[PDB]
Symmetry: D2
């Protein structure tokens, strides 16, 4: 699997100086938990939203992975230099993803494809066989040879534990394209 946690470090002074407080979840008053004023901020896993006042109140500031070495780096209109609450953001991402694997059962070298078509696997990382596919979203056709030639393999949302599962007489797939358009409305 993967369970990476949100990870923001708020320092006491500007330029990553003084006492560091690592936070991994929502914090409705940062004064109460130790750090009373936050001088810099380092996001290692976000994004995060800061707010002006405790209890997710007032001016919002959005933190993404990177260094925020002063107060003014996160806040234009400076009602305050302060930062009272924080919470991780939890994004909605409807990006069409397919992930193709070297070995059966979702093992070995992989290639993730997001939204785009791929007329040549060799022109990416991948010169290996393709033995399993996870379609996390979208509708794809895989093909044996590059530029969408040879046998067609329709890949729709689901797991494909072995190459036979998606119709392959052997585990060879060198190009993929996404099916984007339907000419009729569904339920």
């Amino acid at each position: 699997p993967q369970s990476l946690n949100p990870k923001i470090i708020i320092f006491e002074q500007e330029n990553f100086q003084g006492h560091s407080h690592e936070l991994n979840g929502p914090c409705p008053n940062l004064k109460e938990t130790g750090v009373e004023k936050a001088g810099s901020v380092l996001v290692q896993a976000g994004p995060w939203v800061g707010y002006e006042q405790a209890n997710c109140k007032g001016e919002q500031f959005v933190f993404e992975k990177g260094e925020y070495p002063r107060w003014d780096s996160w806040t234009s209109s400076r009602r305050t230099d302060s930062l009272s609450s924080l919470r991780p953001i939890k994004v909605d991402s409807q990006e069409h993803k397919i992930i193709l694997y070297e070995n059966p059962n979702f093992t070995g070298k992989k290639m993730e494809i997001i939204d785009d078509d791929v007329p040549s696997f060799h022109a990416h990382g991948y010169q290996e066989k393709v033995s399993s596919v996870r379609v996390q979203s979208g509708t794809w056709v895989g093909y044996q040879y590059p530029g969408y030639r040879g046998l067609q393999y329709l890949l729709e949302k689901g797991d494909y534990k072995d190459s036979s599962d998606f119709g392959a007489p052997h585990p060879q797939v060198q190009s993929v394209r996404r099916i984007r358009d339907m000419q009729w409305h569904q339920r």
Copy 2:
């Protein structure tokens, strides 16, 4: 017009001659149709996937809107010219959509945004105040000024029937950008 059902016609002979059969839903046997051997195919609403053997098993051919005048046109790797079952493909495609409204409670002029950041609402014609916002999907950041300058309003899925709802002192939003990435999991 605009179709409410897939539309594929299969012909007995090549170049769209002979007895046609119009399918508008799955067919696990194409012998039933009286078009036992399809010689051509015309997709009017698709896409469709045909199969080599009945009940959707064997070699696959994805047919998209257009003319397929001969058996060869759809099976490059000509192990067979058989075509024994056809079914519509149920195409999964999600978007990320936000809609921002001139006047409170989801009324007045409205600007839809899909997937893309928008650094100038003025450049999308929209010069009006933004009083209410409906976020369908995706995670957005509205700004007061163009080029993602000024006060930030995080706009997540659901409804904001006034501008005070998304933390605005006045109903002014002039740029919006999607947040695409996360580095953490539930």
Copy 3:
């Protein structure tokens, strides 16, 4: 109007005496607006600088309203706006235009950047008798989903479907060749 247009005001919220520029201004003292209070951009984008002759802190203005000096300085190192100019944006496409009748007559399809697996799905069910590739490298195919005969279509003009190697004038799909692993 084919005109870059930025109006600076002397005061905030678009009050006081306006000076409307329609081209570069390397010193804003030779306007009637010593320091700019607010800015409005009707055609852009523009870039301002903190000191004269496009020197110092840079601020990029896009079409819209900037009702205060701090609405455009992320850094308040300065409020000063001492030079402006329009930004001529470099924006390139790949364009191919296919045509129903020979010699670039009849109903036409303009493709830009994107592959097009079904010509019928775009509203074009006509024959393709001539092609004019303006930029990019494309492959047209007889049938949808890049099926059938291939015709490499490169920059330049194809007055008859025989000039791109078609036996009859049928194309129902195009893709762009995007990547090259060699260089000269």
Copy 4:
């Protein structure tokens, strides 16, 4: 300069005496392979033709394995492959390259067409000392989320952070300017 290379083999599945090609060959008779059974492309793409001197049915080969005659021709009334040439592809894409050290040296970052709100999120936590803008109009920013000092980056070279107006060599986000409203 990387160099175009395709290998044609005398039999299927990359068996038999192989031949490397590195430029236009108008007749594979002067190939000790008088017919090819398979084809591997390492640097492409290549367009091949049914007859000598680049005539008849066209076939576009991209990087990868083509283990039989039928892997590259859809409608066969010929299995022959009698001429090859590289394709010079025209990719008018918007590209910017940001380097760790001055004069275009150290760990680098290429951005094509798309904006980048967080450099850290692309695994670039290094300083940015020099910048090469091949095509497009870009604004670089000190902080993530198009915040801090703005640096307008247009077509050309920046051998040092000082050149694009940076007091210190920190860039943590880029966006591309796409739209203009003047001289169309």
